[PDB]
Design a protein around this motif. Structure first.
Motif, PDB file in Angstrom:
ATOM      1  N   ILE A 104      25.948  26.528 -69.156  1.00  0.00           N
ATOM      2  CA  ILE A 104      24.958  25.723 -68.451  1.00  0.00           C
ATOM      3  C   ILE A 104      23.576  26.303 -68.743  1.00  0.00           C
ATOM      4  CG2 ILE A 104      24.086  25.231 -66.112  1.00  0.00           C
ATOM      5  CD1 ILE A 104      26.992  25.347 -65.104  1.00  0.00           C
ATOM      6  N   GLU A 117      31.447  29.330 -68.180  1.00  0.00           N
ATOM      7  CA  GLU A 117      30.787  28.088 -67.759  1.00  0.00           C
ATOM      8  C   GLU A 117      29.317  28.338 -67.371  1.00  0.00           C
ATOM      9  OE1 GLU A 117      31.732  25.220 -68.083  1.00  0.00           O
ATOM     10  OE2 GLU A 117      30.131  24.136 -67.024  1.00  0.00           O
ATOM     11  N   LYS A 118      29.063  29.356 -66.542  1.00  0.00           N
ATOM     12  CA  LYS A 118      27.703  29.728 -66.158  1.00  0.00           C
ATOM     13  C   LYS A 118      26.820  29.880 -67.401  1.00  0.00           C
ATOM     14  CE  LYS A 118      27.505  33.272 -63.460  1.00  0.00           C
ATOM     15  NZ  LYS A 118      27.305  34.624 -62.886  1.00  0.00           N
ATOM     16  N   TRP A 126      34.795  31.349 -65.352  1.00  0.00           N
ATOM     17  CA  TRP A 126      33.629  31.166 -64.491  1.00  0.00           C
ATOM     18  C   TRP A 126      32.375  31.524 -65.282  1.00  0.00           C
ATOM     19  CZ3 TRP A 126      31.142  35.658 -61.872  1.00  0.00           C
ATOM     20  CH2 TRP A 126      30.061  35.288 -61.070  1.00  0.00           C
ATOM     21  N   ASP A 175      40.375  33.351 -64.504  1.00  0.00           N
ATOM     22  CA  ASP A 175      39.419  32.655 -63.642  1.00  0.00           C
ATOM     23  C   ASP A 175      37.999  33.210 -63.775  1.00  0.00           C
ATOM     24  OD1 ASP A 175      41.274  30.842 -62.734  1.00  0.00           O
ATOM     25  OD2 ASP A 175      41.843  32.028 -60.957  1.00  0.00           O
TER      26      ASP A 175
END
Lengths: 89, 89, 89, 89
Positions: free
Chosen positions: D42, D38-39, D35, D31
């Motif tokens: 972006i 993904e951060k 996380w 997880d």
């Protein structure tokens, strides 16, 4: 030990241990808030310095454009000067 | 003088005077064409120099913009460097 | 004609012819000064219009740079928004 | 229970509980890595889009500067045209 004596001791021990745990949490949280405030301060300083850089650049370009304009009008004045200096003989 | 002698003299005189007048016109016109070619040459030189000035200016601005970009990315690398240098303790 | 009559006639004729010549010179010079003033006026108008063009261009670039800045800060706000919208699960 | 039976049961229980704990740690870590990836994705997308914005802006300015140059040279051609259209009369 008496039942009432062991009761009272347990309560003392738990009360003192709770306080130790709480203090450690306070320490962890102080360290974390201070870490985070410093990170944020450095970010904030960089943002400021980049803004000042960007404004220096714009003032520099404006000053150079103005100097270019002076050289151009100088070129045009040496030009007319020279055109009037050419005789018909 | 004989009628035939005065005739012949008039013709000589007019022929020589015509030639004087023509030469002077040629001189006036040479001077004018040369004047005009020089004026045009100076104009042409100024136009060239202003174009080169304008291209120098554009190369200068481009080089300075590129330097600004280097300073900005330097600021951002001192930034991340510093953010990693701040302990959690 | 009497000597005094031919004298007086010559003087009248020269005086009237002088005046004709002078008027023609005045006409030539008026035409030339008017030509030259018009040429100068057109030059002066072009110089003005080019200055206004140049200032329009600079205002346009400044407005577009400002719009670019708005889009950039919008991109950065959708960015942080999205980074906070990503769960740890 | 026999001493040898309670020994064997303890070992079974600890072995199964260890495995539960390990799985949960693996889940937490999956997880967290997801996380963080993904951060980072972006951030990486925003950086790209801002670079493309910046290049669009530069192409736009260059195209407009080129259009300004066309209008300027048009103004100068209407100028010479007009200066030649003014008679000496």
């Amino acid at each position: 030990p008496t039942v009432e004596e062991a009761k009272a001791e347990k309560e003392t021990e738990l009360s003192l241990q709770k306080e130790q745990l709480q203090l450690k949490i306070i320490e962890i949280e102080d360290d974390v808030e201070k870490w985070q405030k410093e990170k944020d301060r450095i970010k904030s300083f960089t943002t400021n310095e980049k803004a000042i850089l960007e404004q220096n650049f714009r003032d520099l370009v404006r000053e150079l454009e103005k100097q270019k304009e002076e050289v151009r009008a100088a070129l045009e004045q040496r030009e007319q000067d020279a055109v009037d200096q050419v005789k018909v003989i």
